C-alpha cells in the first residue's frame, strides 16, 4: 500500500517533514542533495527504513474506546479535553461531529460548544446515563436528539445481518412458533413505569450494546466453519513439529596456499627415559648470558611495537580547529554517501542504470579533486 518503497520515495511532504523534524541529517542533506547535486530519490533510497519509521510514527492511531466514559468532572468542576479525546469523540459519535461542523464555524466558538454539550441531555444519553426530564440540557444541542435517534436507527441497519445457526438466538424462540404457554412475570420482563410504559433502562442497554458493536465493526474495514468450531481439538492428534534436520559433512579440504620411523621413535623415547632417570638437573635452564640478550631484545622489540600500537587505542580529540575539522568531516560524509550510492549502482548489475553509474563515477572523480 502506502508503505512500499516507491510510495515513500515519491512522498515529498513526508520527506520534508522528516527533514524539518531532524537536525543532524540536514548536514548530509544540504551538502549532498543540494550542494553536490545528488538526486533526492537516490538519497532517500538508502534511508527507506527511516522513512517507513517516520511514516509509522504518525500514521498509526489509537484503538476505539469509550471516550465519554473516561470524561468525568474532576462549586466549580473542570475536565481536561485532549485533542485525541476530541478526535475519538468525533469518531465514536458522529452525532457530535455533525453538531460540531454546523455550529462551531457558524454560531459560537468551540469551547462554548463543548461547554454547551457537556451540559446537554445528548451527552448523558451518549454516556449511557438515564435521561430525566428535570434536567435542563442545552436547547441548542438537544435539537439533535431526534436526529441522534435517527442515527441510532440507521446504525441498526448495517449492524443487523443473518448469523450462524450455532448462535442464532432469534431462531431458538422461533423453533416453536405456536407456543402459547404462561406469560413470563415482571422479573423476566423489562421494567415498566406506573403507567406501564418503558422506564428507559433498556435504552441504555441497547445503547451500550450498540456502542460495543460500533467499536467492533470499526475494526471491520480495509485497515464448513461450524465443523471447525465444534471440533474438540484436545481429542485430535497432538501437533507434530516439521522442523528440518541437518547432517553436516566434516570432510573439508585441507588448508592450501619427513615422517619418522618407529625405530628412531623408540630410540628417542628411550633417550628421554635415560635422560629422566640419570639426572634431571633443573639448574641447566639458565641461559649462557648471550642467548638471553637476544631473547630480551626480541621480547622488548615486540613490547615496543605493541605498546606504540596500544599507547592510544565519543570521538577522540583532534589537533584541528573546529572549523577545519567540521569541513573535513562533512567532506568525508558526502564522499562516503557518494561512494555508497556508487557501490549500490555498481553492484546492482542492471544495464539500464549504467548512466547513473557513469554520473556517480564522475561525482567520485570530482570528490577526489575536491579532496
Amino acid at each position: 500500500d502506502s508503505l512500499s518503497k516507491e510510495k515513500l520515495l515519491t512522498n515529498l511532504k513526508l520527506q520534508q517533514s522528516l527533514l524539518k523534524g531532524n537536525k543532524v541529517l540536514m548536514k548530509v542533506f544540504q551538502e549532498t542533495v543540494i550542494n553536490a547535486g545528488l538526486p533526492p530519490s537516490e538519497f532517500w533510497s538508502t534511508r527507506i527504513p527511516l522513512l517507513r519509521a517516520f511514516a509509522l510514527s504518525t500514521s498509526q492511531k489509537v484503538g476505539p474506546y469509550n471516550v465519554l466514559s473516561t470524561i468525568k468532572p474532576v462549586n466549580k468542576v473542570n475536565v481536561n479535553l485532549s485533542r485525541e479525546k476530541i478526535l475519538n469523540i468525533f469518531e465514536n459519535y458522529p452525532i457530535v461531529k455533525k453538531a460540531y461542523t454546523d455550529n462551531v464555524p457558524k454560531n459560537f466558538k468551540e469551547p462554548e460548544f463543548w461547554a454547551r454539550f457537556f451540559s446537554s441531555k445528548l451527552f448523558r444519553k451518549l454516556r449511557g446515563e438515564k435521561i430525566m426530564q428535570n434536567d435542563r440540557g442545552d436547547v441548542i444541542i438537544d435539537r439533535y436528539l431526534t436526529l441522534d435517534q435517527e442515527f441510532d436507527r440507521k446504525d441498526d441497519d448495517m449492524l443487523l445481518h443473518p448469523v450462524k445457526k450455532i448462535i442464532d438466538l432469534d431462531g431458538n424462540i422461533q423453533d416453536d412458533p405456536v407456543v402459547r404457554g404462561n406469560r413470563p412475570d415482571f422479573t423476566m420482563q423489562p421494567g415498566v413505569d406506573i403507567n406501564g410504559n418503558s422506564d428507559g433502562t433498556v435504552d441504555i442497554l441497547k445503547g451500550m450494546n450498540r456502542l460495543s458493536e460500533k467499536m467492533i465493526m470499526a475494526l471491520k474495514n480495509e485497515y464448513n466453519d461450524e465443523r471447525n468450531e465444534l471440533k474438540i481439538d484436545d481429542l485430535n492428534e497432538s501437533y507434530k513439529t516439521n522442523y528440518a534436520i541437518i547432517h553436516l559433512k566434516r570432510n573439508a579440504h585441507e588448508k592450501t596456499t619427513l615422517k619418522v620411523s618407529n625405530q628412531q621413535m623408540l630410540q628417542q623415547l628411550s633417550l628421554v627415559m635415560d635422560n629422566l632417570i640419570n639426572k634431571l638437573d633443573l639448574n641447566q635452564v639458565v641461559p649462557n648470558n648471550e642467548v638471553s640478550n637476544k631473547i630480551n631484545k626480541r621480547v622488548i622489540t615486540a613490547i615496543k611495537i605493541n605498546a606504540k600500537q596500544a599507547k592510544h587505542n565519543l570521538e577522540v580529540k583532534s589537533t584541528l580547529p573546529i572549523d577545519l575539522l567540521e569541513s573535513c568531516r562533512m567532506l568525508h560524509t558526502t564522499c562516503c554517501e557518494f561512494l555508497k550510492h556508487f557501490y549500490i549502482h555498481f553492484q546492482s548489475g542492471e544495464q539500464k542504470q549504467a548512466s547513473t553509474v557513469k554520473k556517480l563515477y564522475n561525482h567520485l572523480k570530482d570528490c577526489i579533486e575536491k579532496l
Partner: peptide, 21 residues
C-alpha cells in the same frame, strides 16, 4: 541557522513544484 535552512528547503520544494508544472 535553522530559519535559512527551512528557507532553502522551501525554495527546493518550489523548484520541484515548478518541475512538475
Amino acid at each position: 541557522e535553522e530559519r535559512e535552512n527551512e528557507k532553502t528547503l522551501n525554495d527546493y520544494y518550489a523548484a520541484l513544484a515548478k518541475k512538475q508544472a
